Each structure stands twice: as structure tokens, then as C-alpha cells.
Amino acid sequence: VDICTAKPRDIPMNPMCIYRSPEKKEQKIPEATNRRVWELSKANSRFATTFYQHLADSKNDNDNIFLSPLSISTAFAMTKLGACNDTLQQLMEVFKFDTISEKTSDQIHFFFAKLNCRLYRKKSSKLVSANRLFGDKSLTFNETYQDISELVYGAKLQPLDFKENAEQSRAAINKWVSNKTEGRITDVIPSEAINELTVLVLVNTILFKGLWKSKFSPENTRKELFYKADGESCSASMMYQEGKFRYRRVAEGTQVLELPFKGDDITMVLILPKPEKSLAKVEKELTPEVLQEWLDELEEMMLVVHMPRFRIEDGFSLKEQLQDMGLVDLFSPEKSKLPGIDDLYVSDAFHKAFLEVNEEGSEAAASTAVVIAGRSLNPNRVTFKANRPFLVFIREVPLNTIIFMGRVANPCV
Amino acid sequence: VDICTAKPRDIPMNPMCIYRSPATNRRVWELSKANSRFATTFYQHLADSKNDNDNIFLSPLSISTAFAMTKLGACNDTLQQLMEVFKFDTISEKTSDQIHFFFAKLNCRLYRKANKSSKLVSANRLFGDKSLTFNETYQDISELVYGAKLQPLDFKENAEQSRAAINKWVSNKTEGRITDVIPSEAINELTVLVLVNTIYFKGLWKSKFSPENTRKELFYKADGESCSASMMYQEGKFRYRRVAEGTQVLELPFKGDDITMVLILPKPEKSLAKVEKELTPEVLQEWLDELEEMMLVVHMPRFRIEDGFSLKEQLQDMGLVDLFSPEKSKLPGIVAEGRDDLYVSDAFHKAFLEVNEEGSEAAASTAVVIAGRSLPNRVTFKANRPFLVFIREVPLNTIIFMGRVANPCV
Ligand SMILES: *[C@H]1O[C@H](CO)[C@@H](O[C@@H]2O[C@H](CO)[C@@H](O)[C@H](O)[C@H]2NC(C)=O)[C@H](O)[C@H]1NC(C)=O
Ligand SMILES: *[C@@H]1O[C@H](CO)[C@@H](O)[C@H](O)[C@H]1NC(C)=O
Ligand SMILES: *[C@@H]1O[C@H](CO)[C@@H](O)[C@H](O)[C@H]1NC(C)=O
């Protein structure tokens, strides 16, 4: 009985410890696409967009960004497995799982079961989950929890010594993650983050590696000025190439470009607004249904792509924002209530996201040059030149899931 | 006896007229350079007459051959001009006849091999009138160095059943690819002889393409119209070299490594024009040396193009006049009695190329016509963003085929 065969009966949860979300007062549903995976992903996306807009304000327009809502959601989802009462009512409400009409907190875990099966299930374009919870090596760690936090989210409890080993912990951890993420994510937990008062700490991240299905050519990269959020400009390494790429021009000339990865199931979506418009307006106006709609109308088209190479690493302390967003009873010592594992609450949540884009894709560079003989394209054709701030997305199409999302507001070095 | 293994002193070849200019394998190599030089020169003269978006294809090897043959019965002045325009004079010895021997050695090292997957053959043939008497020295030697036999045909009354007669022989020696070397009305009652050459190629891609990864795609002609193509695609290690003003030189070897196709596309902005205008055997060689193996993506159209035309015009512009003159033409070694009103009415050429996922198939034929009609022929099939193509034999340094692919559209 594994993740890909689980039926609701294989994912039980303590009664008198359940939530019932309200009825939603239509359905782009494509071909053979499991509706439950579809519904869940819409909620993950609702959270992905919301969380992102709040994280945008708390940052400068010139700051880059990059996280993994899929990460954070599957994380706090794992934790939520043992939530209950007013604590749980908040995990649902805040991660929009409560927006999947009528669906009960116990079902949510069966959906993730379904999504997770299809998500991380293996040539190229590998996706890996690095989520795990950390609490003191003390009291009850209800086995039933783990037994499932193994089947569904694939990673057990894991108690540490927040006392005699409060330091070789914030290293036992950083060592774990940085191992799974094949060395990409290193300093998972910041400095002076773990001590004795540290009760529980949540750590989440993802590892995506893949090649552009239509690689750019090194021989074509050329330094170019990138106009930033302020007014200035700088030296960025602009990549160049042409070919069929799903595209679409939308509201007030904002460009939406899809570059796929080998496999086609994992793609990168760029959202570049016209020069006169600010990424700000776009970021704020970007709602789950607007974004969802935009992607729905992408048509294959021949065009000229100009996109800068860029690297982006980022660390987060989910706690403050999460709180500010409504999630609190989990971060409070007296208000907590996780009967799945007393006074046990979350001391902090840390996330690290990493993305480096070159002429080949995500994986290590190379020199693969491109030779296209016998091709003549229309002189009048679309042109997508990203020499100004744009959004980024790495989604899994068939599962309509936003894996990573970010903002490249300064690619230069 | 074997015309191949033979040595210089063994071959009896003792023509009618010898020309005097002002190490065998070292000479065969010098012939190839002579030929290669004729190929680029000739090619430019052929470009400098078409729209820079016009398709072009030919086998300069096929041409250099048919005329090497004609050179046999050639004499005084015409014998020299032939020695010049085909740069046979740039060969070691200052003795015409010597050439013919080296050319046969080359044809041995080319079409005569113990197999190699890459099929590469040649067939030659003379076609004389039913009522004439051909000089026996010519006929024996024509069939000695080129394996060119002399078959009869009624040119005096059945000029037409004759063309059809000849065209088919090529159609047979070129897998039905070249089926119309000689046009219509080009051979009449006064038609004396007709020298013909044919070369056929067909190799498999060493690194085959995938029919799966091929995609139909719109291609825009220079005009403004567009037609569907079919690009193939594959990633792999290849000899390549971004050079010049961003020109790309790519080599695509066939099963054997002895015969390779070299593509040459100029920077998207620029055009072939300045590339063609500078093409020479050394240039093309310079590039061939820089080619370092490299990991790279290859996008190539799965197409086929045919091309036909007359060698008269250009061959004249290049200095070959006498042979075409009903007066100055001197070909006394052909019609026994020593007849001397034999001149080349016209020379026709017809080539064929087809590139697909398995490999390519090239065929060409050249027909020299002595005293027939001297009629420009039919047109091509234009498009845009063109690129050069050469199918060459590397160990032998000879351009078998070459051209400018412009319109791949089917
Ligand atoms: C975590 O706590 C629960 C109690 O809520 C434990 O569940 C009990 O398990 C035993 C043995 O399977 C049963 O006899 C009880 O009936 C269960 N409780 C109820 C009311 O269902 C669970 O075993 C605990 N986990 C650990 C660490 O043992
Ligand atoms: C709700 O919380 C109370 C304590 O506040 C706890 O005893 C109970 O099990 C929880 N669930 C229900 C349905 O009462
Ligand atoms: C035939 O031509 C050869 C040289 O081409 C010459 O030796 C001979 O004199 C000629 N004899 C005839 C058949 O007229």
C-alpha cells in the first residue's frame, strides 16, 4: 500500500479533530486530469498568489524574490495532519485548503496523496521534496501521525536536542536539507535560530533540475542594459533565440511567455509588463483567476526571445508573515494544540529557494551551440525582450501546479 | 588491363594534339585542387546570374569530367582553353595527355572502392551518328580512361528518338533521378556526337536524424508569401566553427567519414553574397581545418531540390570560346577522316539533391553536344534565407556536389 494506491481509508485522522469548510456559493477541467488534483492545486495556487503579494509589499521593488509555495503548502500541510480545533481551523483557512468546497481536513491529505504521487514520480526534469518538521527529543510523537506523515508527505517527525545540542541541531538540520537538495540549498536555518527555547521548527524546500526543451545558444548571449525598478540601469547577460513558444499578449500589453523544459510537463512562465507599466501594478492586480485565465489562452507562436541569465537564492522566516496573514494559534505556546504529537507549538518556519537560469536551463551550463539551417521567419513577428523586471513561475502543467514563483527585478551582477 | 593500377609509362594514351604549359598521388591531388578551383570559380559565375534567393545545385566533378573527355578529341587553341578553364594547366607536367591519366586515377580512387556504405558511382558514354566513322584512337582511348563506349544513333533522321534515347541512359545510371539531361530540339540532323557523364551518390547519416523529432514549419519566401517546410532536429557532437562575420560552418559526415556534407550559413543579418564572392579552394580549406568537434543542436530541413541549366554562357565567360565557335572549334581527333567542322553546339547539366533523416541522395549528369541546336532552358523554385552545401570526399579533396539551398519547401 503506497502513495499511488492510497484510498481515503488509508489516510485516517482523529475525529473531534476535523474541520468542515463551507460550500462555495466554473470548471476549466481538461482531459484525463484527476479532479481532486485539480481542486487542490487551485487552492495551493490561491495561497501561492496571496502569500506572494504580501511578501512583495514587505520588500523593495528592486529586490529579487523566489520561493516555492508548493513547498510551504506541503510543509504546513504535513504539520496540519496533527492539528486540531482552533489551531486547525486556521491552517485550513490560511492555506486556502478550506476553499475546496465542503471537503474536510481529512480529505485534503488524500488529495496531497494523489498530487504527491504524480508530482515526484520520476530521465530529465527531476523534482525532489525536502520537507521535514523538527521538535525536541522529548514527549509523545504519536506514531499514527508519522506512519502517515510518511505515506503522504514522505518524511518522519525527527526529534532533536534543543538544550545540550541546540547548536549541533541547527547543523543536523542544515546538513540534512543541503544533502537532499544535491547541495543547492545550504544554510537552511539561519544563524542564532536554534537554542533551548526552540520547541518546534519547520523546514521546507524543493529541488528542480531540467533542460530547456529549446536551448538558447551561448554564441548568442550579449551584455545588455536592464532597466530597474528605480530609474537606473545595469549590465546583464541577455540570452537570445527564436522559435515556437506558447505566448499571449494580455491586459495593457503585458507579455506572457512559456519556455518549456525537456518533457514539457514542467515549464517556466515569464510575465513581463509593458515599459510604461510597473511590475507593481501587475503584481497587485495578479489574482489566482486572472493568472489562471492568462495561461489558458496561450497559443503556440513564432517569436524572438530576449531573456537575461540570472541566479536567485532566498531565505525566509515564514512565521511573522504567516501570522500577519491569520495563522497564529500554531505559533503561540499557550494557544497551540497539536494532539498529533505538553505546551507544544512552532518556534519558527524556515524556507530556502534556489534558481539559476542559463542557456541550457537549470542544470549546469555547457557550450551546446545551435545551428538552424533552412529557416526564414516573418519579418513582422512578435518580440519578447525582458530587459526590465518580470515575474517567474515554474509550473507542472498536467497537475496545474505552481511549483516555484519569483521576481527577477535585478539580474545583473 | 586495369586502367587503375597502371603506371604512367604503361598507359599508351597518345592523343592527336599535345599542349605545352609556359609524383602521381601528388599529381592526383593537384588535379583535385585544379578541379576544386574550377568548381568555385564556375559556381560564382553561376551565382552572378541568379537572384540571391535562387536555388542552385550541381556536380562540378561531373562537369570537369565530361569536358576532360571532350578534351581528348580537342585540338589547337581549343585544347588550350579547355586546359585553362578547367585549370588542368595548374597540374605538374606541361603535357595535356598526362592529365587524362591522373583524372582516371582519381576516378579509380573515387568510384572504385571495396564498398563503404556510401555508394558513389560514375558512368560515361559517347553517342555518335549512325552514318559516321569515328577515329579509332579516340574511341579506344575515350573508353580506356573513362570507360566511355561509343554507341550509335540516327541523328540525321531520328534526332528526337535519339535525345529520348540518351536521356534515358542517364535516367538509368542515376536511379531515375536525372531524367532529362538533354532538353528537346538540342539534337538535330547535323548532330555529330554527344559526350555524357553521370555521377550518383547516396550515403547514410553517420549520426541519423529522428523522423519523430521532425516538425512542419512555415517558411517565408523573399517575396512575402510563405510555404510549409519540415525541419529535422538532433543534438550531438559535430565538427563546427563559428567564424568570419559570424558565419557557421557545419560538417555532417556519412557512414564512412570519407564523404561529408558541409553546410555554411552566414549570420542571420548578413547574406551569402559576400561569402560566395570570397569562396576559393583555400578559403573552404581554411574553414575545414578550424572545424573542432563540438556539442551542439542541429536543425536541418528534410527536403529535395533539382536543378538544370546550360554551361554555354558561363563556360564562355570563363574563357572557353573556341570549342563553342562553329569556326574556331578544333576537334580533329573524333571523325576519322579528320573532319573539321565539329564544334560544341551546347552543353547541358542536370543535378539532384535530397536530404532526409537517413541521409541524402545526390545525382548529376553533364551532356556535351557536338553540332546540335544551340537553344537558356527552364526555371528554378525560389525562397529566402539560403545556405551553401558541398558533398565532398575528404581523403581525396574533391567537391562532388555543391550548391545553394534556398527553398526547402516540398
Ligand atoms: C497518540 O495518542 C493517541 C491517543 O489519542 C494513541 O491512540 C491510541 O492507540 C491505542 C493503541 O493503538 C488504542 O488502544 C487507543 O484507543 C488509541 N486512542 C484512541 C482513543 O483512538 C496513539 O497510540 C498515540 N501514539 C503513540 C505515541 O503511542
Ligand atoms: C476541541 O478542543 C478541546 C479543548 O479546547 C478538546 O478537548 C477537544 O478534543 C477538541 N475537539 C472537540 C470536537 O471538542
Ligand atoms: C585518329 O586519331 C589519332 C589521334 O586522335 C591519330 O593518331 C590518327 O592519325 C587518326 N587516324 C584516323 C583514324 O583518322
Curated annotation (Swiss-Prot), chain B:
Changing K94E: In AT3D; Dreux; complete loss af heparin binding. GO terms for cellular component: blood microparticle; collagen-containing extracellular matrix; endoplasmic reticulum lumen; extracellular exosome; extracellular region; extracellular space; plasma membrane. GO terms for biological process: blood coagulation; regulation of blood coagulation. Changing L388P: In AT3D; type-II. It is found in: Secreted, Extracellular space. Pfam families: Serpin (PF00079). Changing R20C: In AT3D; type-II; Rouen-4; lack of heparin-binding properties. Glycans are attached at N76, N115, N135, N172. The record marks R373, S374 as: Reactive bond. Changing L106P: In AT3D; type-I. InterPro entries: Antithrombin_3_serpin_domain, Serpin_CS, Serpin_dom, Serpin_fam, Serpin_sf, Serpin_sf_1, Serpin_sf_2. Changing I264N: In AT3D; type-II; Haslar/Whitechapel. Changing R27H: In AT3D; type-II; Rouen-1/Padua-1/Bligny/Budapest-2; lack of heparin-binding properties. Changing M16T: Previously Whitechapel. Most important serine protease inhibitor in plasma that regulates the blood coagulation cascade. AT-III inhibits thrombin, matriptase-3/TMPRSS7, as well as factors IXa, Xa and XIa. Its inhibitory activity is greatly enhanced in the presence of heparin. It is linked to Antithrombin III deficiency: An important risk factor for hereditary thrombophilia, a hemostatic disorder characterized by a tendency to recurrent thrombosis. Antithrombin-III deficiency is classified into 4 types. Type I: characterized by a 50% decrease in antigenic and functional levels. Type II: has defects affecting the thrombin-binding domain. Type III: alteration of the heparin-binding domain. Plasma AT-III antigen levels are normal in type II and III. Type IV: consists of miscellaneous group of unclassifiable mutations. Forms protease inhibiting heterodimer with TMPRSS7. Belongs to the serpin family. This is Antithrombin-III.
